[PDB]
Amino acid sequence: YFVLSALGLVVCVLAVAFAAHHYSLLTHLTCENAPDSCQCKLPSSEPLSRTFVYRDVTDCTSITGTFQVFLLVQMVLNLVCGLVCLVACFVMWKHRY
Amino acid sequence: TSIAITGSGSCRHLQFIPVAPPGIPSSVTPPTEVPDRDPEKSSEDDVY
């Protein structure tokens, strides 16, 4: 039980980090509507740039709307679950050591 | 016996002897244009 509480803590921490990084990425892309898709590219000093294609997306608002809301909810839930696992370990060693 | 008056030179698209030609040429198929674009890329190794 202690081992799995620690494992849940580390997995939730990894999820928090990945969600935060993905949100930080999505804060800095400019995206346009492509046929049944979205083309999100990043501004560059040189005229060339790297873009990404999100298929099966009618309008990019779904990426700029409910997607970032979903990321925020996911990171909030992940941090809450990580806190729960950490305090579970805390009580475990407060009754164990 | 026969006379065949045919165009040439600047009259390439013209035949003047009536042989009753029913020839109707087809249309050129439209080839898909293939522009090549090479923009820069950040490393996909950023993912790993």
From Swiss-Prot, chain A:
Disulfide bonds: none annotated. Keywords: Cell membrane, Membrane, Postsynaptic cell membrane, Synapse, Transmembrane, Transmembrane helix. It comes from the Eukaryota. It is found in: Cell membrane; Cell membrane, Sarcolemma; Postsynaptic cell membrane. The keyword Repressor does not apply. The chain crosses the membrane at residues 1-19, 70-90. GO terms for cellular component: dystrophin-associated glycoprotein complex; postsynaptic membrane; sarcolemma. Its main location: membrane. Residues 20-69 are extracellular. Component of the dystrophin-glycoprotein complex (DGC), a complex that spans the muscle plasma membrane and forms a link between the F-actin cytoskeleton and the extracellular matrix. Preferentially associates with the sarcoglycan subcomplex of the DGC. This is Sarcospan.
Swiss-Prot record, chain B:
Residues 22-45 are annotated as: Disordered. It comes from the Eukaryota. Residues 34-45 have a biased composition (Basic and acidic residues). It is found in: Cell membrane; Cytoplasm, Cytoskeleton; Nucleus, Nucleoplasm; Cell membrane, Sarcolemma. Coiled coil: none annotated. It is a single-pass type I membrane protein. The record marks 13-14 as: Cleavage. N-glycosylated. Transmembrane protein that plays important roles in connecting the extracellular matrix to the cytoskeleton. Acts as a cell adhesion receptor in both muscle and non-muscle tissues. Receptor for both DMD and UTRN and, through these interactions, scaffolds axin to the cytoskeleton. Also functions in cell adhesion-mediated signaling and implicated in cell polarity. This is Beta-dystroglycan. The chain holds residues 703 to 750 of 895 of the full protein.
